């Protein structure tokens, strides 16, 4: 059923599964009109579809044109998400199609379920975890390729860079969500922490810096410390 802290290591067995995060699909800025009314301006968005075992990110860029002449956009965004996930699945060779898709937001269950009707043997599941995939657009390279795009377009990434060459999926996934947790709670500072030292760079084909094993420890500890500082501040603890 629902994914939570109990059935957490399932993400790392050898059943193909993907997470689908729909939070950055329909993005707007809110502004005032000449007459003083409020209006929205949509910007480009992205479906965040991630295999947590391998790091394979299928970033489906959502061009603002898709909304042109449409009503109930936040509702439509959910259906376009499911249409695009289904199309991803159909495009994958059978042996690669996922056996589970885990939506990060319960509202996506019914659109996905309806779009996946041709794949009855793929289970659509909710989750009770509080995953931080909305901060995907705080990763500079993902935000850049989304914002530059001029047409619908899919871009493949590995969100783990080359970490799996030295650590396990479980660990990889925890580093990732820790880094994104920090990025969600205080982007300025999280980014400060990653980029302070100009001598540790990001490879042209990577998303994150090329930290050594020792350096990843200092980083994870600074991420941790930031997150607990920000919680104290929010609640006065």
């Amino acid at each position: 059923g629902a994914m939570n802290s109990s059935n957490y290591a399932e993400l790392f067995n050898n059943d193909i599964k993907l997470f689908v995060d729909d939070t950055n699909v329909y993005r707007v800025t809110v502004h005032k009109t000449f007459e003083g009314n409020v209006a929205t301006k949509a910007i480009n968005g992205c479906i965040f579809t991630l295999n947590p075992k391998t790091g394979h990110l299928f970033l489906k860029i959502i061009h603002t044109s898709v909304w042109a002449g449409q009503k109930r956009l936040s509702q439509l965004a959910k259906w376009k998400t499911a249409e695009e996930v289904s199309a991803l699945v159909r495009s994958l060779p059978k042996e690669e199609q996922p056996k589970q898709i885990i939506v990060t937001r319960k509202a996506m269950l019914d659109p996905l379920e309806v779009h996946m009707l041709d794949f009855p043997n793929i289970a659509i599941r909710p989750t009770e975890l509080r995953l931080p995939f909305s901060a995907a657009m705080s990763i500079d390279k993902l935000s850049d390729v989304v914002m530059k795009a001029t047409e619908p377009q899919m871009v493949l990434f590995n969100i783990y860079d080359d970490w799996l060459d030295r650590i396990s999926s479980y660990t990889a996934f925890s580093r990732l969500t820790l880094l994104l947790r920090a990025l969600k709670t205080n982007e300025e500072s999280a980014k400060m922490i990653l980029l302070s030292d100009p001598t540790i760079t990001i490879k042209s084909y990577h998303l994150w810096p090329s930290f050594t094993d020792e350096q990843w420890i200092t980083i994870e500890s600074q991420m941790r410390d930031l997150i607990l500082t920000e919680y104290g501040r929010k609640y006065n603890v």
Binding site: A82, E83, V114, L117
Partner: peptide, 11 residues
């Protein structure tokens, strides 16, 4: 939520 109820493309 069935094929009977949902035309392909008019999901």
């Amino acid at each position: 939520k069935s094929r009977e109820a949902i035309r392909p493309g008019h999901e």
